[PDB]
């Protein structure tokens, strides 16, 4: 049989040559508000042919969400301080390739690899010429995304070296796991976020001699996620006092929650360097020579997915920039900057891709690990 290689190398779809991919966790869903199960869905005859009629897109997360955890496992063995955040995106990068089988347009990565330190909490990766070195002391947010036919796996987890963020990455995780228990179809998005915040503040935790009530912070969200669309447009709180709007049998949610020891509450910080198409603009016609070109570069190599400025620069673009500002005022594109909490704060995220199945709930990027 084919084996993955050490370091990883093989892509996923020669690992599995039948072109099944593995499950991730099943659950039933959870008891509705009178107490009645789920356990109904598991077996029942309509949920079950109208789950196996969309057999081929859940098998298309499967198989990105097998490239993410493989991906993952490797870039927990090596990553260290003393590294540049360039080195460690490239070397993660360079790996999600490979085991994705990129293609254009029909598997490749979904979105850039975050690696937000310390009070910034979303949205960094380096651009060109960064010379960040991550520290003993950082607290390092990698958020990674696959996909197989944009079939999106969006999920993230927090580095650390020193052990006085044990109890931070603890909360932030336990807030996840809750967010992920109480998701459900005809569950209220509201209620997700309570009980993710009930479980976050339930934590104290000390950090240099300073104690603090972990923060869930408020403007960060989780996200449904469509077909080459990151952000389909419902979100899912991380703290009480949302919309009741109700998840829906065959959606697909990122559960994403951050804790933090600031305000727990993000402002764009940092230069930019993640940048995507808006979904819902259509053709617009340029004629000015640079913009056109890069409209038609991201066009043909990344579509609505998110993209950053080292994957142009990869492709051989230079000199972009204005390009780039154009098509943003343009609002053709749209810049997403780093999102950081006050100076001296540190957040933590963890994330998790479901699929909201007619038959049960898969967390398709659960892993060994997380
Ligand atoms: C998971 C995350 O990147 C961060 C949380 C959430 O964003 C917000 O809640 N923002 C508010 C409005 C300040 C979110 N929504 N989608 N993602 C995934 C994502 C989006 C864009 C991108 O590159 C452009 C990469 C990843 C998020
Ligand atoms: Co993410
Ligand atoms: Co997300």
Redesign the pocket.
């Known amino acids: 049989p084919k084996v993955q290689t050490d370091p990883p190398s093989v892509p996923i779809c020669d690992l599995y040559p039948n072109g099944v991919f593995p499950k991730g966790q099943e659950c039933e869903y959870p008891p509705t508000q009178d107490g009645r199960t789920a356990a109904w869905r598991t077996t029942s005859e309509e949920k079950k042919a109208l789950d196996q009629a969309s057999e081929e897109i859940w098998n298309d997360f499967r198989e990105a969400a097998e490239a993410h955890r493989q991906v993952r496992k490797y870039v927990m063995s090596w990553i260290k301080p003393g590294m540049t955040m360039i080195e460690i995106c490239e070397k993660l990068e360079d790996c999600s390739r490979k085991l994705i089988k990129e293609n254009g347009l029909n598997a490749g990565l979904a979105?850039?690899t975050?690696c937000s330190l310390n009070n910034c909490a979303?949205?960094y990766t380096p651009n060109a010429g960064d010379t960040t070195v991550l520290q003993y002391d950082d607290i390092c947010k990698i958020?990674f995304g696959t996909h197989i036919s944009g079939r999106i796996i969006?999920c993230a987890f927090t580095v650390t070296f020193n052990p006085k963020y044990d109890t931070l990455l603890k909360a932030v995780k336990d807030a996840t796991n809750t967010g992920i228990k109480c998701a459900g179809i005809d569950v209220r998005l509201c209620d997700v976020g309570e009980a993710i915040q009930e479980v976050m503040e339930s934590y104290e935790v000390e950090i240099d001699g300073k104690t603090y009530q972990v923060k869930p912070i408020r403007?960060?969200?989780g996200?449904s996620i469509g077909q080459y669309r990151?952000?389909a447009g419902k979100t899912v709180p991380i703290v009480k006092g949302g919309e009741a709007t109700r998840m829906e049998e065959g959606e697909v949610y990122?559960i994403?929650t951050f804790g933090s020891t600031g305000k727990g509450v993000?402002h764009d910080d940092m230069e930019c360097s993640?940048?995507?198409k808006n979904f819902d603009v259509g053709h617009v016609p340029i004629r000015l020579p640079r913009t056109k070109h890069l409209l038609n570069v991201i066009n043909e190599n990344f579509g609505t997915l998110?993209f950053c400025r080292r994957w142009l620069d990869r492709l051989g673009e230079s000199k972009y920039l204005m390009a780039l500002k154009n098509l943003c005022d343009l609002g053709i594109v749209d810049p997403?900057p780093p999102?950081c909490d006050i100076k001296g704060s540190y957040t933590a995220q963890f994330?998790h891709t479901i699929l909201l199945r007619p038959t049960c709930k898969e967390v398709v990027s659960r892993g060994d690990d997380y």
Do not use: K, R, S, T
Request: hydrophobic content about 40%; glycine content about 4%; aromatic content about 14%.
């Open positions: 979105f850039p975050g979303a949205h958020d969006d403007n960060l969200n996200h990151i952000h990122a994403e993000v993640h940048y995507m998110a997403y999102l994330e």
